[PDB]
Structures are given as structure tokens and as C-alpha cells.
RNA sequence: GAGCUGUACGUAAGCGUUGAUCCAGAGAUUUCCGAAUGGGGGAACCCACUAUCUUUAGUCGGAUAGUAUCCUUACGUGAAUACAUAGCGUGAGGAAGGCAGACCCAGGGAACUGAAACAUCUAAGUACCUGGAGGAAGAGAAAGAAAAAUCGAUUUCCUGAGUAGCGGCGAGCGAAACGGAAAGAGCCCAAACCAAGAAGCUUGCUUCUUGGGGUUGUAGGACACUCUAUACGGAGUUACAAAAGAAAGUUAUAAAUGAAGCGGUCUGGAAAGGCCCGCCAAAGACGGUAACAGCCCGGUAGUUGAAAUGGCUUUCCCUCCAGAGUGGAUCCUGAGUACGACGGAACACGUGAAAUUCCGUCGGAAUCCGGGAGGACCAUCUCCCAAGGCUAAAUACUCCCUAGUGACCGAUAGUGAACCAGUACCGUGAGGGAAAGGUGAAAAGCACCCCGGAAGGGGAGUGAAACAGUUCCUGAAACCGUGUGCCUA
RNA sequence: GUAUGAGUAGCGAAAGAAGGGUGAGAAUCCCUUCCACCGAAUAUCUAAGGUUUCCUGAGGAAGGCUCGUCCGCUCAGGGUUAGUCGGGACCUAAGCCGAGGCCGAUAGGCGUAGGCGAUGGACAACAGGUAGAGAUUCCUGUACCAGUGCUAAUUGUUUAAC
RNA sequence: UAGGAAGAGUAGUACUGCCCGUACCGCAAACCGACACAGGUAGAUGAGGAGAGAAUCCUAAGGUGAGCGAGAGAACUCUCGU
């Protein structure tokens, strides 16, 4: 996976294409991503200790990797992402020459 | 045979609560251990005086859950009285 | 793991005996219901283990 | 074991034929015959058949 | 290089950039049964002995190591029996069992069937049982093929050819050599002779061991002399003798890097699709992504990379080595064998005019002025030296691993088995042996209200779709119903 | 896979009645009284065999030839205590295995020493208590068998107790 | 008896004694019969009146009321009584 938790993301396809968001957890596992504020699914969920109340509840669904490119940290683009020996560790560079 | 390798875990339940204040004891050991290897790990564990034991082996209940049968484990339960002067054993 | 090389080989044995009954204890407290933390039985366990592997590799 | 301990001849396998050819199994035997001779560096009973004894042995 | 504690949701408790989970090489641990091997046993169980250590005041208990049988070989004891042998004990090597339902060599070896019946014959040396292996096995360096001339170990393929032959001359069985190719490779003993030991002393001899010599058909060798070489040169663990060690390179077992469109617009739940424009290409293989993607993702072409272990190829190291001529006086060249009679078998060849090869039983040669073969046999000629052994490649098969392919199947098909399948179930047992795939892109898997004990419904909500609601894509026919236009006692 | 026969045959020997209770629901479950049946058994133990069917708290889809609030059914937790009872560490019968051994195309067959093998021989514990589930096992009282150490006297020591 | 022998029994005391089975059914709805099946299943105990009796009828201790019912009282079929 070329996105990892804390970064930034361009959503490419689907029906909420062309926004913007922050990771919070990918599953490697099954080529999925989670990202703030996209697909978000109303749950009915019944009463229990987690939200004794119950109701509907709005939260975000896991998406497809490949519907989403890093932005470029700089500029502010998606960008395809290229590999570089920098120092000892392998770090990530843009197709803009940035990072 | 290293003592504490021997006795497995206490056996907690309203049958060996009851007895548990007749200074008996009641515990899980090895499906090998015998009659005075238990009583021997249980003085060097403990720091007790042995009076008696007793053992008895029970099979394997058959479960399922669904389309797949099986076993439970092998149990072999041993009853320790201490004598009457000698320190108790907590559980608690 | 590299903590155990330096160890002269006797007090090694000494660490394996204190954690058997650290062992014997979190399974009596387990069986109980008085144990919260059972992680730390798993890694007791590989402690030991440890321990056991560095001695016998210590006498090829 | 049934055999010579010198050439090494056994019982063997072939036809009796009869008049109108009518074929039929049957065996050929070796003309063993149990007689004492140095085995080794002892004496001892064997089988050896009456061909090793035409010329040049040990006893009988 | 950022998540992880499998399928498997889940809660709980935790671990990770001081680099976890994961992937590859090398190690450590490896309960009990099973050849099962200390004795026994109804499988995974029971009971021991001998030494050392250990706890108890002592019995009781624990840990460690050894203890099966047979073959070979050393040492010690040791009966009838005097020497001695058998037997007994100890030590050191080896074997035992499995399987890949394949391939192949040997021992034993059917019947149904065909002959329009059946017995010789066929099926067929097949099925099967037993033994032995090997990665291949078997065969193999002429006592050969053949004919007016020659070839030069074996094996496999194409032809010869359904020919010559065999055959109740019926049904049927059925070659080989020459010719053309693949692959190619040759060697080691026994015996004369020489040197040393001990022995029967078969007593001035022979008879065993050891080493050297020498292995062939124009005969060769021993034996004699002319020459050189004792490492000048040559060979090697695939035969030719055997066992180790290094250096280099390559390869197999993890991986790294890797070009170009978030292009605009239309429909749509969603664009990879339509229309209008760009680019990359040693990369337009394949798969995924909310519908059909070279330019979104894993990747692809190309270029790189191995700490560790294995394979392969060279080199070094190491080891081991006589080969030519001439005379051949005299000696050697595989004995109860080669053959022959009798009884069988294998040869395409069924006893036939029956050569060739093998087995059982009897008889039984010559040995270089010698012996065998050329389809009975004799004479002449031609070819060749049996009764000892070894040998790679070309050939057969696939339980497996890696990379791919298909005018091969698509859930009654394809493996019996696409799913917890040799399972469930059946049988005392050997053994026989199934059925069973699909919600959706994403659980967003129906909060809340109403009838009901519940199941199940009617709304509401999610979703593009709920007539996709947990046999859930599509949903035919038989079959079971409700309503009605025309007819019917 | 689904029909016709068709709401048809059958529902597997036998005496039940009423009153209370539970429950959404009762001929069928629980309690009470009366009646009836077996009684050299339809009673009490105990081998073989079965293998959790045993007990408690919940359950009512399927199984129960009807119903079910119930069950030998479903779910979750429990439950089997031995020096003296039956069997091993004791013994052997029929039979089986069998070092060497005899026999035999292979495979193997037979068999000596030796060993396994009860349905038989020998061998030390009785009476009560136990309100969810074990009792010659646990508990109470009184015993017996084999062995070990610690004390106190006794005796014997290589013509030699034992 | 052959053998082994410097320790031996005696009395009192305290201690030691291993493994396997143990639940429940067991003329039965839990075993063998495909079934909660009118069949089959070794042994010990097995009371009273009348009686020779373990026959026969009625009962004791103990155990059961049998896993479809109610209501009518036709032909015919089965098992019984005159
Ligand atoms: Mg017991
Ligand atoms: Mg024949
Ligand atoms: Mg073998
Ligand atoms: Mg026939
Ligand atoms: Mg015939
Ligand atoms: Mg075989
Ligand atoms: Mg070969
Ligand atoms: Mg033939
Ligand atoms: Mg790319
Ligand atoms: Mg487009
Ligand atoms: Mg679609
Ligand atoms: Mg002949
Ligand atoms: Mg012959
Ligand atoms: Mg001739
Ligand atoms: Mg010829
Ligand atoms: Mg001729
Ligand atoms: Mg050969
Ligand atoms: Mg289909
Ligand atoms: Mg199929
Ligand atoms: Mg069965
Ligand atoms: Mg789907
Ligand atoms: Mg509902
Ligand atoms: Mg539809
Ligand atoms: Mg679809
Ligand atoms: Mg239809
Ligand atoms: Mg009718
Ligand atoms: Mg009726
Ligand atoms: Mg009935
Ligand atoms: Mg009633
Ligand atoms: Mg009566
Ligand atoms: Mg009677
Ligand atoms: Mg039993
Ligand atoms: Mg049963
Ligand atoms: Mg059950
Ligand atoms: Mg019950
Ligand atoms: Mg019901
Ligand atoms: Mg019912
Ligand atoms: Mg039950
Ligand atoms: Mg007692
Ligand atoms: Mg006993
Ligand atoms: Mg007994
Ligand atoms: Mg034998
Ligand atoms: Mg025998
Ligand atoms: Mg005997
Ligand atoms: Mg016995
Ligand atoms: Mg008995
Ligand atoms: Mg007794
Ligand atoms: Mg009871
Ligand atoms: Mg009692
Ligand atoms: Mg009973
Ligand atoms: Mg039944
Ligand atoms: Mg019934
Ligand atoms: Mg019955
Ligand atoms: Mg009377
Ligand atoms: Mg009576
Ligand atoms: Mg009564
Ligand atoms: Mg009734």
C-alpha cells in the first residue's frame, strides 16, 4: 500500500470524488482505507452498553485503495509516488521532485 | 517431576466450596501423576502436611456446534486433606 | 534476549525457577477469577522458553 | 533352504506334457542327498547333491 | 517498513519506528504409539532390572544412562573327552520397516474369451502373489553379422514387412541382417614367471597367504636379450585404484528500482463506457478497483541484489602411474565344463529335416600339431577364441516442485470430493460410499411504532434494487390456489 | 421435484375419575383423594453391553405416531474419592506366540526351553450417617494385613542365636 | 536339607501402602432386533392365606395405570358366553 495512517488523500472515484480527508486506519489485508467525513453509512444499531441509547449512528466505511491518491505535501496535487535512498531509510518522492 | 509442572489449577465450583472448610482440597493434576507424586508437590508447593489423597479420572464430554463433533479434554481430579495442624490453603 | 548472554549460567537457572512459580501463581489466580491482566502469561511462557534455549545452546 | 551348498541346485518349474499334449505343471528336483563335510573350519550336515560328490569332496 | 495477537465476528488484555506481525536460509526443543527394540499387551497401555545422584528418621517417591534378535568379526571362558570343538559372555560394525496404485529384473503363474462346439492352439508369460533394486533398470566390448566385399561393443527410432517362416498348415502367431539416424568409450581379473612368511612336513618337497607381472586370435603372454622412462610426461573418484581440502564463476531458495491523463464533457448508484483532446512504450502480459483501464493499484519489459545453505563448472591441491622391438627352444591361456542320451522350456520357430540358448538327471573331451560357428550332417573355405567380472549417453515413467499452454469442463459437467470427502452413512469384517457453489460495490444485515407468548407480518429506515432480508443472482415445467368473460343438471 | 389413491389405512396388547396449581394456551405437566393392575414379578441387587443417556437452571423450532407448560430432546454449568470390593504388580487350563531347531520354489509351516491366557485356585472391614447428583470408597465408631523407623529390656557372635 | 550367616526376634509407639473400574439403564423407551418395536438376554434374593408345591386364585414390601381421544351401540370380521 502506497497510503499508511496519518496521511493526506485525494479521493479519485466514486460518489463522493473529488474531496479530501486524513486516513485513520488502513487494513493491508483487504486493500482498504478509512478515511474522516467519506462513505459515511447510517447504522441501526440496538441498545446496548456502547451507546445505551442506540438510534441511527453516522460513521465513516472503509474504501478501496486504489480510489485514492496522496496529495502532494507542497503543492497540494495527487501525485504518484516514487522511492528514494535518503540518509540510510527509504523514503517517499513525489513526481514533482518534492519530499 | 518439577511439582508445579504436576498440579495444574485449583477447581472452583459449589461442590469443592462446600468440602473447602474441611481443610479438602480439590485441584487439576496430570493424567499421569499418581497418588503420592501429587501429595509430594503438594508439601513442596504449599508448605503443608499431606493427610490424605484420593483420584479420579473422568472422560471426555462430546460437544458440537454444528455439523462438527467432538471432545472435551481429559480431566484427572485429586482430593488433598491437610491435618489438623497444619496452615490452610487460601483459593481466595 | 541479549540481557541473558551475560548472565554466568547458574543464576540463569534461578530465573527460570522465580518464573515457574510467577507462572504457577497466574494460573491459580486465572483458575480463581481474580487475574485482569492475562497477557502476561504468554509472555512468561516465552520467557522460559528463552531462557531454557540460551542454556542449552550455552553447552552445544 | 533346500538346496545345494556348493553349486547351488534347487527344485525348478516346467510342463508334463502327455500323449494329445495336454500340458500340465509340475517340478524338477535336485538329487540332494544330506551327508557331513567341513562347512567352514567345522563338520556339519548339509544338503549337497549327488553331482558336487561325483569327484573331490570332503566326506561321503 | 507500520501495523499485529490465523479461520473468526466478538469482547478482554496487550505488543510495536529502541523497528513488531510477515518472508527465506541455518539451528534448538520434539509427550505417547508405530520396524518399536528391557518384558508383556486387546495401539497410543501395564510391569521391570542394573549403576550414579537425590528427598524422608526410615519404608514410600524422583532424575539420568544402559538392557531386543540375527549376520560378520575380535577377546575371555569352556561339556560329554585327554588336546580340542560345541556352547556361554563381553566389545565393535551392519541389517530390520515404509512407499509413487508409475517405470523393470527375477521366482511362481490362471480363467473367462477366440477357434461361430472343443481337447493341441489362443487369451498369455497377460492379471495376480513373492523377492531385489535404481533414478533409471536390463544389454554391452564378438567362441558376432555375413558371403566372391567386407563390417567392427550395446541400446532406441524409421524401413525391411504383415515379407521369410510357424500353424488341429485351422483360428491365428510372426522375425532378423543389410540400409538411414540419435548417442558414442573402453577396461579389470584367473593361469605360466618372480620375491617373502608360516604350514601339511603328501618329508628336501608341496600349499596357503602377501606383493609384483599379464590378459590375446594377424594369436597373445610367461622366457631371453636390444632401448627409454621411475616422474621427463600422463591419468583420476560416472567403468578404468581410492579419500579428503581450498579459490573463482554460475545457479536454486527472500527481494529492490521501474515510463506515461485526478484531461474536459454526457448518461449513470458508481466510469474503466460514448464524444473531443494529450502522452508512454525494450513496458498494449495478467489480475483487482462501484460497468469494458497501457497512463488508479499489485505489477509487466529492462536493469539490479544473497548474510546463509545446496547444485553445477573450471583451477589449485591431493593421489596414483612404465611402454617398444626381436627370437618365441620350453611353459600358460577359465574341468566334472564343453558336449551326448532322456524329460521340459525359451527362441517368430507347436519335435519337426531343427541349427542356437537355458533347467533337472545320468555319462563325459581336446587343450594351439588346440577349440567354436556359418539353421540336421560331412569335406573345403571364411569368421571368431566360450566355460570370470565391470562400464556413462542415446530409452521408459511422474507421488512431487517452478514457469506456462489449451478450436479441455463449467456445479447432474470436471477428480469420488470447487464447500471441514474417503467425511456422513452402511457392513462383524475385508470393503462400499454420497448430498451440499452465488445477498450486496460496501453489512450499510431492517433504530423506532403497531398485532402476537413466539414465529411471522404492516409501516418507518438503509440501499440503484428489500418482488436483493441470511438457499439471499436469474427463477422455467409439473403441482397447489384466489378473482373473473363465455358454456354447462 | 411434484401428483393420484385421500383427509383414506394406521396411531403397536392394559382402567381411570374428580378437585386444586401453573401457564398465552391443559384429557396429556405438578399436587391430593378414590379406584384399578403385577406380586417365582411388571419387585431388590448384579455381570455383559451401551457410553453421559445421571443432577440442577433455563427452552419449545425439529424428535415424541395426538397435545405438551413435559421428556431418555435443545442450551449452559456440574457430578464417579478404595491398603481390605472386581482386575493388574500372584497362579495356571483349553488355546496362542515361540531364541536355537526341523521342514519347505519365495512367502512361510511345525515345534523345544520360555512366556501369555479366566470362564477356575490363593488373598487383610464391618455397622450406621449422608434432602441435587458417589459410598464396604467420603464421614463417625471399632478393626485387621504387610512393612518401616524410634525407644526399653533379652539373647547370640564364626565348633557358630537366626 | 543344600546353602547365607552377626546380628536377631520381643514389647510399646508413630508413620507408609501403587495403577485400572466406580455416574446412569440393565426382562429394558438407555443392550441385540433400521423404530420410544407384543421377539431374545447369564446369575443372587424372591413374603402371607388355602396348598405337596416356585402350581392356582387373592394380597404384603415394592412398583405401575402403558404417549391419541368421546359417543353411538348398524351390516361384516376377530376373541368370548349361553
Ligand atoms: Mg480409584
Ligand atoms: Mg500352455
Ligand atoms: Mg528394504
Ligand atoms: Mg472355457
Ligand atoms: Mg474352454
Ligand atoms: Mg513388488
Ligand atoms: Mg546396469
Ligand atoms: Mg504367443
Ligand atoms: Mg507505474
Ligand atoms: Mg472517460
Ligand atoms: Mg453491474
Ligand atoms: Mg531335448
Ligand atoms: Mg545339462
Ligand atoms: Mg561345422
Ligand atoms: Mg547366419
Ligand atoms: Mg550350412
Ligand atoms: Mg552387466
Ligand atoms: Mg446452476
Ligand atoms: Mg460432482
Ligand atoms: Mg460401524
Ligand atoms: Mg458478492
Ligand atoms: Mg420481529
Ligand atoms: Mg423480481
Ligand atoms: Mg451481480
Ligand atoms: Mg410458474
Ligand atoms: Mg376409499
Ligand atoms: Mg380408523
Ligand atoms: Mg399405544
Ligand atoms: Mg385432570
Ligand atoms: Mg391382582
Ligand atoms: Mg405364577
Ligand atoms: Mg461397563
Ligand atoms: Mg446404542
Ligand atoms: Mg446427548
Ligand atoms: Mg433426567
Ligand atoms: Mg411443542
Ligand atoms: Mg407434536
Ligand atoms: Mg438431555
Ligand atoms: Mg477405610
Ligand atoms: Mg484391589
Ligand atoms: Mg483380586
Ligand atoms: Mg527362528
Ligand atoms: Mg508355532
Ligand atoms: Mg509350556
Ligand atoms: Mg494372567
Ligand atoms: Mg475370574
Ligand atoms: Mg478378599
Ligand atoms: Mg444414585
Ligand atoms: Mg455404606
Ligand atoms: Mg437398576
Ligand atoms: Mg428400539
Ligand atoms: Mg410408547
Ligand atoms: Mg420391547
Ligand atoms: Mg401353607
Ligand atoms: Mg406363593
Ligand atoms: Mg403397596
Ligand atoms: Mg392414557
Given at each position: 500500500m502506497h497510503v499508511k495512517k496519518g496521511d493526506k488523500v485525494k479521493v479519485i472515484?466514486?460518489?463522493?470524488?473529488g474531496k479530501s480527508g486524513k486516513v485513520l486506519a488502513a487494513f493491508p489485508k483487504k486493500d482498504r482505507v478509512l478515511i474522516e467525513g467519506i462513505n459515511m453509512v447510517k447504522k441501526h444499531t440496538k441498545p446496548?452498553?456502547?451507546?445505551?441509547?442506540g438510534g441511527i449512528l453516522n460513521v465513516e466505511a472503509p474504501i478501496h485503495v486504489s480510489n485514492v491518491m496522496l496529495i502532494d505535501?507542497?503543492?497540494?496535487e495527487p501525485t504518484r509516488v516514487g522511492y528514494e535512498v535518503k540518509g540510510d531509510k527509504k523514503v517517499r518522492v513525489a513526481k514533482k521532485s518534492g519530499e | 517431576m518439577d511439582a508445579r509442572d504436576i498440579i495444574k489449577r485449583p477447581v472452583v465450583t459449589e461442590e469443592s466450596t462446600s468440602i473447602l472448610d474441611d481443610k479438602k482440597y480439590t485441584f487439576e493434576v496430570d493424567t499421569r501423576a499418581t497418588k503420592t507424586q501429587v501429595k509430594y508437590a503438594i508439601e513442596e508447593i504449599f508448605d503443608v502436611k499431606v493427610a490424605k489423597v484420593n483420584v479420579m479420572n473422568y472422560k471426555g464430554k462430546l460437544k458440537r456446534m454444528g455439523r462438527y463433533a467432538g471432545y472435551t479434554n481429559k480431566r484427572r481430579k485429586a482430593i488433598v486433606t491437610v491435618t489438623a495442624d497444619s496452615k490452610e490453603i487460601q483459593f481466595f | 534476549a541479549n540481557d541473558i548472554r551475560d548472565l554466568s549460567t547458574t543464576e540463569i537457572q534461578d530465573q527460570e525457577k522465580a518464573l515457574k512459580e510467577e507462572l504457577f501463581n497466574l494460573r491459580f489466580q486465572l483458575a480463581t477469577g481474580?487475574?485482569?491482566?492475562?497477557?502476561?502469561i504468554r509472555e512468561v511462557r516465552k520467557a522460559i522458553a528463552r531462557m531454557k534455549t540460551i542454556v542449552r545452546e550455552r553447552e552445544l | 533352504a533346500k538346496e545345494c551348498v556348493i553349486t547351488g541346485r534347487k527344485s525348478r518349474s516346467g510342463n508334463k506334457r502327455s500323449h494329445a499334449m495336454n500340458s500340465s505343471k509340475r517340478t524338477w528336483k535336485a538329487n540332494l542327498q544330506k551327508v557331513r563335510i567341513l562347512v567352514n573350519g567345522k563338520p556339519k550336515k548339509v544338503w549337497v547333491s549327488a553331482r558336487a560328490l561325483k569327484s573331490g569332496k570332503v566326506e561321503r
Open positions: 472515484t466514486g460518489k463522493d470524488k446496548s452498553n456502547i451507546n445505551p441509547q505535501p507542497k503543492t497540494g | - | 481474580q487475574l485482569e491482566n492475562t497477557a502476561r | -
